Design a protein around this ligand. Structure first.
Ligand SMILES: *[C@@]1(/[C]=[C]/C2=[C][C]=[C][C]=[C]2)=ON1#C[C]
Ligand SMILES: [Ca+2]
Length: 274
């Protein structure tokens, strides 16, 4: 039997999938700790590794496999179901088993995706500081027609202090926050003027290293929901540019409260997919 994570219906992904739009022919690159390619509920078509000693098709952490399942866990009679189960998944390892990677390794992963015709890039990662080479890579990937989604950060808030990390803080990147099954903001979701949209990030169940499934919390779980929504929209309107898809997502989001806390609200793919 296949479990359907509460995040799929909450963002109305099940409604557009039912119309027969599931991300087919859309290339998605998950810049993470790799992906357990052998996982029976995932189909990795390719990728690259910029982490010394580790192949792209192995995940010693569990993070990238989890994020990848949220985006494209196969629609079958087992495991879970992804937001866009027909998307072409590319694992780009830019982080190691400990969940860390250099700036060089990240911008390299960004360039590889842009150069190899990736339609969407998900970066469930962030830092307190950015780089000029990082900003350059992301801006050029966006201006070239790639949708760039990044986790906003798990530094909750302070008292009127922007806690959005990099690259989420960049103009060309969609900063994603986290809500729970009740659609309420999760207390760990970063806050700031760059917050753009929200998605399921608390108690998210997805694929996990060595043919199993686990539950994780974090804006690193929310991000793949928007990356998958972007893939769903593209599989329906392949004529859209990055900014139009981006626009669809934020203009049709369900308002939830102050934008400094919820951005434009929780995404709605049925409305976004037109
Ligand atoms: C996720 C993470 C992510 C990030 C961090 C910082 C900044 C940005 C992004 O979540 N993990 C896990 C669970
Ligand atoms: Ca499945």
């Amino acid at each position: 039997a296949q479990t359907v994570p509460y995040g799929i219906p909450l963002i109305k992904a099940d409604k557009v999938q039912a119309q027969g739009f599931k991300g087919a022919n859309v290339k998605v690159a998950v810049l993470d700790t790799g992906i357990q390619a052998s996982h029976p509920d995932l189909n990795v078509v390719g990728g690259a590794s910029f982490v010394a000693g580790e192949a792209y098709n192995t995940d010693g952490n569990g993070h990238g496999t989890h994020v990848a399942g949220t985006v494209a866990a196969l629609d079958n009679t087992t495991g879970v179901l992804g937001v866009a189960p027909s998307v072409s998944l590319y694992a780009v390892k830019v982080l190691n088993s400990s969940g860390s990677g250099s700036y060089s390794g990240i911008v390299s992963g960004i360039e590889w995706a842009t150069t190899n015709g990736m339609d969407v890039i998900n970066m469930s990662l962030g830092g307190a500081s950015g780089s000029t080479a990082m900003k350059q890579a992301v801006d050029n990937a966006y201006a070239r027609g790639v949708v760039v989604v990044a986790a906003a950060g798990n530094s909750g808030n302070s008292g009127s202090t922007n806690t959005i990390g990099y690259p989420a803080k960049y103009d060309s990147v969609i900063a994603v926050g986290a809500v729970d099954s009740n659609s309420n903001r999760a207390s760990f979701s970063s806050v700031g003027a760059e917050l753009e949209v929200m998605a399921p990030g608390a108690g998210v169940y997805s694929t996990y290293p060595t043919n199993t499934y686990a539950t994780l919390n974090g804006t690193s779980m929310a991000s793949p929901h928007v990356a998958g929504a972007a893939a769903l929209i593209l599989s329906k309107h392949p004529n859209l540019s990055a900014s139009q898809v981006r626009n669809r997502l934020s203009s049709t989001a369900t308002y939830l409260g102050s934008s400094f806390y919820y951005g434009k609200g929780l995404i709605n793919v049925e409305a976004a997919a037109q």
